Amino acid sequence: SSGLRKMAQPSGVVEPCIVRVAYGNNVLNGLWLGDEVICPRHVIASDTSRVINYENELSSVRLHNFSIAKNNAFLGVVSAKYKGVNLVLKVNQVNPNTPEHKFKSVRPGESFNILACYEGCPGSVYGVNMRSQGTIKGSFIAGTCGSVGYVLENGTLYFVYMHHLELGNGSHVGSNLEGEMYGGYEDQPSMQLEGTNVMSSDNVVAFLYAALINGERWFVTNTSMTLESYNAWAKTNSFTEIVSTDAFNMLAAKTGYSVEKLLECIVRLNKGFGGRTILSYGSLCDEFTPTEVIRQMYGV
């Protein structure tokens, strides 16, 4: 008996890269790699409630107002620049704890980690999952602007997210580190609205395999749905189409349930759980990948 809960990858390699960036009385988080610091550009905005002429506020910038802090280090800004919706400041000191790292964008359905930091100080760590409309469900308290998302693979450190705005439904929009905004949302306090997120079928199937593994089986049906019928239904029901059974073939033989059988479950269960629960959830979550599920039920 296991249960299915988000975990985050350890934050130690990341924490020494998180700096306090202040300008005037604007304080937010920044990312310190090499002799550069990356942060959201609004730290220079005179105001953040109507549209800012950002190119004018770059001409307007004064380097002595910058107060960038990290431990015992005070970092002097040599120069300032934009890379998309973020600032790139060159500083006079190289981060002595710079890890090997890379930048990439996380794709819809993929899990990664948020290191939520209040004005320089890392505060908490948790797992999230990028959604098709380019938003996430964070917990971003005021103070955490510029907080950083990352994922570790092989074990290459990828920086994937930097936190920017909150939409009316509470969805959170960040940029990657090349400074492109997820979902294409502009860096302005304008009327912007989130579309509809397409559910990750791969993730939902993983979720259901987890429940079976756990010994939860009440939702399993006396019937099934072919891969090509599911995709035809998926297309008109805001679910992604399934390419291959292949990533599920271990999970399938280990439970004895085919993917075909979990496809029909997705269709019926989407109409509601009817008051019952699966792994204590009230509905299908698509936040766990097949990789996450395997790793926590079986290991490695």
Partner: peptide, 5 residues
Amino acid sequence: XAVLX
């Protein structure tokens, strides 16, 4: 409706 963090 977008609030800048």
